[PDB]
């Protein structure tokens, strides 16, 4: 009851009465006594002493406040910070938050490559105007790259960073290349040998057949994947030998699978998996796809596909003296059993360099060709379209961006509703003062916002909104906020039904009267503002009392009244069977109760 001990003179000198409001507080004492002491008690000024004593903690707080938070990224492993390493970088994720150093180049590289990917994707919407629409997008896309407002017609060239998108977009500019290739996300390069294209068939489901191409001669290449080097030689649709110098399980597995597809080694180039027969669609929405990229996509779905591909490659039992250079199904460095024609080692394979620049030729499918075929890039080796916010950017030509969403639609509708006010005749305040609400049910803006409304039960929403509007107008008690909130629903015809307390749009969102919400929120002392997803909007007018009267914006045929606990709690349905002079409590939100009376 009074477990907490205390002092005696300290109590009377502070004049702490027991049972202040039936709370004893107490030598011994209760816990509420601390509440009573910190809410009504002596006043000191000792802040400086506390800060000086706790300088270390408050300096840590200051340092924390001295941070410029940066982005985070999921990845792996190939003092003042020790206080925060827990929140700075784990093992699967990491945050690049910095303190004093600033250098915006690699972020600029990521941005430019992302936007290049974006634009090259945007050009994939027709069948004939590929290059034209591409180049026009480029010329119509400017950026505040870094600190300089530059255009996207010189950065692609001035930059030196090999990539499928950089090359795919620069070839149209007759720009220089570096003899590099791109088979999917992997990066390849030639070392020696050469050959010519040759065609062969492959079955699907055991009955059909499809043609693919490959090379028949011997040729060595330099593959490369994330944290994984390699070297290998392809010969007659099959992989002869291969070596690796980057030790990681997943990286090595995926790199090996990609190099195998590049060599088309394996029986799945004779027949196909039973998973492909599920689709047999080596085609885009309206375009064609080879077999290699289809196989790759089948790999991306699950690692079981990768394991199946690797089993297709012969597995054998390792002999002595080779464990150190063997491999395993799961990328294990050494194992009693390994795969045929493999070699693991340590140290990344030094990559060669080609100092010979060239220019390629784009095709209908934008596939670039340097010579003897030998595709260097394409859209097929790109990720799926990924929406990402672009800043420091200008994109003017049509197809720049849809810029059309239900949220933005609602935002624009409400902006129009707000501007319509216009402090003039034939606008919201004139019709209000005139008590002509019917015209409000015919305005253009409500007609533009109507499509965003839930169609199945729009009649009841319109009925309720038309009830609130009339009941607030006729009497003269109203609030512009709730009105504008419910207006978009006062367009269709009223009907009978069951209302719950929320107005639902077509995007599964909703709105509710007498409460605030992300889509629409407002509060007194700032009534000149209206938040929409946090976006503060302004009112072309000023009001100090037009909003203070919300007694009719909560329910339809009721009015708020003085609080009374005796009144019984009810729901929104039983309201129909109430009478007059009969108060009733009811929830108006989360833990928000209010009393109401009919009329």
């Amino acid at each position: 009851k009074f477990p907490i001990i205390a002092n005696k003179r300290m109590l009377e000198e502070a004049q702490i009465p027991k049972e202040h409001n039936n709370v004893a507080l107490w030598v011994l004492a209760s816990a509420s006594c601390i509440n009573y002491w910190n809410f009504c008690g002596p006043c000191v000024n000792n802040s400086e002493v506390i800060k000086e004593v706790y300088k270390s903690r408050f300096g840590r707080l200051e340092r924390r406040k001295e941070i410029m938070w940066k982005e985070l990224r999921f990845t792996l492993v190939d003092p003042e910070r020790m206080e925060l390493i827990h929140a700075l970088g784990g093992e699967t994720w990491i945050q690049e938050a910095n303190t004093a150093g600033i250098s915006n180049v690699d972020q600029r590289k990521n941005d430019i490559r992302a936007v290049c990917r974006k634009v090259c994707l945007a050009a994939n919407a027709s069948i004939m105007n590929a290059k034209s629409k591409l180049v026009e997008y480029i010329k119509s896309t400017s950026m505040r790259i870094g600190e300089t407002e530059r255009k996207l017609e010189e950065l692609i060239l001035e930059t030196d960073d090999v990539s499928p998108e950089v090359t795919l977009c620069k070839s149209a500019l007759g720009g220089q290349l570096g003899k590099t290739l791109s088979f999917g996300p992997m990066l390849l390069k030639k070392i020696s040998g050469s050959g010519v294209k040759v065609k062969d068939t492959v079955y699907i489901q055991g009955v059909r057949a499809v043609q693919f191409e490959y090379w028949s001669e011997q040729e060595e290449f330099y593959g490369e994947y994330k944290s994984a080097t390699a070297l290998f030689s392809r010969k007659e649709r099959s992989l002869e030998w291969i070596t690796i110098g980057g030790g990681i399980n997943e990286d090595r597995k995926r790199l090996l699978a990609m190099c195998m597809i590049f060599c088309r080694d394996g029986d799945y180039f004779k027949d196909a998996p039973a998973t492909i027969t599920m689709a047999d669609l080596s085609t885009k929405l309206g375009r064609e796809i080879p077999y290699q990229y289809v196989m790759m996509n089948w790999i991306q779905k699950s690692e079981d596909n990768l394991e199946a591909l690797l089993y297709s490659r012969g597995i054998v039992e390792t002999n002595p003296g080779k464990m150190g250079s063997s491999m395993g199904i799961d990328g294990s460095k050494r194992a009693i059993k390994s795969l045929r024609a493999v070699t693991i080692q340590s140290g990344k394979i030094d990559m060669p360099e080609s100092k010979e620049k060239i220019h390629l030729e784009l095709s209908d499918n934008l596939e670039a060709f340097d010579s003897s075929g030998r595709i260097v890039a394409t859209i097929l080796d790109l990720p799926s379209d990924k929406k990402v916010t672009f800043q420091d950017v200008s994109f003017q030509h049509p197809d720049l961006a849809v810029l059309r969403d239900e949220k933005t639609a609602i935002t624009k509708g409400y902006e129009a509703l707000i501007k319509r006010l216009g402090t003039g005749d034939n606008d919201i305040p004139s019709l209000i003062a005139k008590k002509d609400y019917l015209s409000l049910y015919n305005l253009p803006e409500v007609k533009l916002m109507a499509p965003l409304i839930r169609p199945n039960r729009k009649g009841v929403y319109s009925r309720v909104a038309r009830k609130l509007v009339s009941t607030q107008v006729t009497t003269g008690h109203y609030s512009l906020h709730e009105l504008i909130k419910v207006l978009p629903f006062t367009y269709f015809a009223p009907k009978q039904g069951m209302f719950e307390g929320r107005l639902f749009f077509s995007n599964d969102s909703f709105v509710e009267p007498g409460v605030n919400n992300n889509v629409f929120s407002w509060s007194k002392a700032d009534s000149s503002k209206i938040y929409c997803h946090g976006i503060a909007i302004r009112v072309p007018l000023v009001v100090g009392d037009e909003h203070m009267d919300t007694s009719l914006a909560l329910l339809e045929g009721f009015s708020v009244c003085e609080n009374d606990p005796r009144a019984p709690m009810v729901t929104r349905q039983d309201l129909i069977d109430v009478g007059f002079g009969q108060k009733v409590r009811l929830f108006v939100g989360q833990g928000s109760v209010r009393t109401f009376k009919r009329t």
């Binding site: 907490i4 002092n7 300290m10 109590l11 000198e13 502070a14 702490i16 409001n21 039936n22 709370v23 004492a29 816990a31 509420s32 601390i34 509440n35 009573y36 002491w37 910190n38 809410f39 009504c40 008690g41 002596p42 006043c43 000191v44 000792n46 802040s47 506390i50 903690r57 408050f58 840590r60 707080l61 924390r64 792996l76 206080e83 925060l84 390493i85 827990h86 929140a87 784990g90 093992e91 994720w93 399980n249 997943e250 699950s302 690692e303 079981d304 002595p320 003296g321 080779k322 464990m323 150190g324 250079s325 799961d330 990328g331 294990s332 050494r334 194992a335 009693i336 833990g591 109760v593």
Partner: protein
Amino acid sequence: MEINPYLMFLNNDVTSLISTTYPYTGPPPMSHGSSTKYTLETIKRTYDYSRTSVEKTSKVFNIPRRKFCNCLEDKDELVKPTGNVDISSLLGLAEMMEKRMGEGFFKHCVMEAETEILKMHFSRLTEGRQTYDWTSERNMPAATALQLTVDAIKETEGPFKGTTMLEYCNKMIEMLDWKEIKFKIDSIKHDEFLIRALTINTMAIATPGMIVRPFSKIVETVAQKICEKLKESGLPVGGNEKKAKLKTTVTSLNARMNSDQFAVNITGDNSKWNECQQPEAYLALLAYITKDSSDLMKDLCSVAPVLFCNKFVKLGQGIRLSNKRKTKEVIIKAEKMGKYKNLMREEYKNLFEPLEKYIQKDVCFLPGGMLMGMFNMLSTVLGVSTLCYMDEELKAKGCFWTGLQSSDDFVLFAVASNWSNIHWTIRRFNAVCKLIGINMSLEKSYGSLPELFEFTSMFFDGEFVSNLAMELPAFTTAGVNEGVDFTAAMSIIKTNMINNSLSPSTALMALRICLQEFRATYRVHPWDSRVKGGRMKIINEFIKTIENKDGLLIADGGKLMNNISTLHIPEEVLKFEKMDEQYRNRVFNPKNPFAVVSTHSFR
């Protein structure tokens, strides 16, 4: 349809889902009652794991003393646990480890431990889980029994003015020779006080008294100073450092052997790590250690061992009787079970007669073993000595081993160039381990290729090292103040995040859970809530007088403002500049009737 929760282990790993196998951390509801049956079984299995039959009646008690050390017999069925230790091999392994690490290694460590102890205040002993009072004959925190002991010394032979560990130890020693001792009132004789001091109670984790406490602390300090320099010692700390040790070991291994060898890992689990550790071997080992150092430490380190060689064990609550219909039920203590042995069942009888010799009044004179969770550092040192073994018989065959060992859990790494010599190496290792009592289980110890193993719940794999040691606080059991228990929980969560046992979303969920636990503990809620509790009454009226609701304290209808990047920062420091100056000065008023020093404490 049939819901089989386990089919997600096929197309996925195990390091990602193993956590779903064990319940969430907390105080278990199992509550096993240490009572006469289990303790007697423990003592029996102890005397049995001793494979000898020799004895020597003492002169201080007139009781036999099973000496199970350096007298191995009954070699048959050696698979089962053994406890007979050989001193020669022990000292040989110690010499190997010394040679490896260095000559003045043990000397440097013991010197550091000494100097650290010198400036130590005996009051430190108040920091302990629990102990056993030798006057009230019960279990309590350390501070209570310490106050009892000091006030008894005062009442009997004047106060203790040492204010240091060494004077405390010497006072205990002298008290071992006092004939009469008093305490609030009653007194006792020499033999009874000796027994009480050498008594232990089952909490069957041990719960020793206070006399031996400081010597155990000294020995543990030394063993700790030693385990730090050892690469294969994951006891003193865990997590980041533990993973560092793991990967260092693995990489050194990979860089050590050749292309012709092929490695293997083993997940081992020592069984009966408490019923096979003997303090006599520990004493000989400590002697060999301090051999070249101040005789002070030589004598000091030789205290706790002998104190454990003679340890009376308090038998739990005695058995009960009953008639057929159970309408009547008698209750008897342990000391009198030897008086009604003719009634108890056989299984309970055959477990009591062979030990009646060692009983004195109500306890059993256990002459060895190690039941407490003590000397864990020392046992770990002994294990590391076991792992640092190497000879020429192995070198000739081109094989060796290495690994890591916790208190009673370890991980082995064997090396060879044949699928058979590995077995020979494993058997050699098991033999050398059993030579000194360190055994291993067969139904709980497995092994496989190097990629996969486990250690202290940290399931290592080729990648994706997963931990499972997620700890949490508990307010109801440990209630201190409304300004410390939240900051401590934030620090705990931060730590758990450091050890990778927690992730951002997981940490946030745990935070929002602990906040609610805190509130419900101290019976506090926010102001937005429509509660009617006592503390809320006043808060329901003195709330409108403030505007900086954000600055309010959680203990006073406040709301949270800390997050992941603001854990080290207490909410107070985070709301100081925001609290309405009135409330601020009303809290930080040193002129009140009562880490951050608030006006929220519960003395």
